[PDB]
């Protein structure tokens, strides 16, 4: 049983373990309230059943640590007891962009543009600091109460003292199931998909804006050394065109945006 009230030897602050948020693999993660400032946090508790285990999950926290970034879920302190290990996170209210896809389907153009700016915005501040995600997907591209992106979970992710490109790839692949609704690759069989990925085999539609699908072309291409550096993403005709609001509504977790 996870303790009710969280305690430090470090900071020795006080963390009251509330409302559930979710499961993750093998962590539990729960909405956890500062007893003394009273700011809400996000504490990811992971049990010493699991954790060479041990061994991932430091180089995670290591690398979490270091980041601070607008785009990046903030990393404010871990610590551990006898039974479990707790990582203190930055609060994301509104799941992420998979659950997202999931009620919404294919997006409208401006969503993708406002969501793929966000995240490439917090990958370039990855990528300039030699750190490479490489697990980027829906499902770890967090929301806060206000729809701003927050890159999280870096379990796979590693620093640098394949490589950059990969993360491209996996943003090529988001930005595809956005605009699509449907992922680039993904089947129900997991050895289809693995083959379908090194024959390079995807369809973008005819209908959606050649402006956007030739970008996704570029970023899903074979040769790793022809796909956009994160820099060049930002600069795209796909985002320097259409429209592109600088907010979005929580409205847009279930039903397209009227933009009023």
């Given at each position: 049983?996870?303790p009710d009230v ?20 093998f962590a539990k ?103 490479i995600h490489r ?126």
């Amino acid at each position: 049983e996870i303790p009710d009230v969280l305690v430090d030897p470090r900071t020795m602050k006080r963390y009251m373990r509330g409302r559930f948020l979710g499961k993750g693999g093998f962590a539990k993660c729960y909405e956890i309230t500062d007893m003394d400032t009273k700011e809400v946090f996000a504490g990811k508790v992971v049990p010493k059943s699991m954790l060479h285990q041990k061994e991932k999950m430091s180089t995670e926290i290591a690398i979490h640590k270091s980041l601070d970034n607008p785009h990046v879920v903030g990393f404010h302190g871990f610590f551990e007891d006898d039974d479990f290990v707790y990582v203190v996170l930055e609060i994301c209210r509104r799941r992420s962009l998979l659950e997202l896809h999931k009620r919404r389907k294919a997006v409208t153009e401006p969503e993708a543009r406002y969501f793929m700016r966000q995240t490439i915005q917090g990958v370039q501040y990855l990528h300039n600091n030699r750190v490479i995600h490489r697990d980027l997907k829906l499902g770890n591209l967090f929301l806060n109460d206000d729809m701003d992106v927050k890159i999280g979970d870096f379990g796979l992710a590693t620093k640098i003292e394949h490589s950059f490109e990969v993360d491209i790839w996996s943003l090529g692949c988001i930005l595809y199931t956005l605009l699509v609704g449907k992922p680039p690759f993904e089947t129900s069989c997991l050895k289809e998909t693995y083959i379908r990925i090194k024959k390079n085999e995807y369809s973008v539609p005819r209908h959606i804006n050649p402006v956007a699908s030739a970008l996704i072309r570029r970023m899903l291409h074979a040769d790793p050394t022809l796909r956009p550096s994160v820099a060049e993403l930002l600069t795209d005709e796909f985002f320097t065109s259409g429209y592109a609001p600088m907010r979005l509504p929580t409205s847009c977790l279930t039903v397209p945006p009227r933009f009023s």
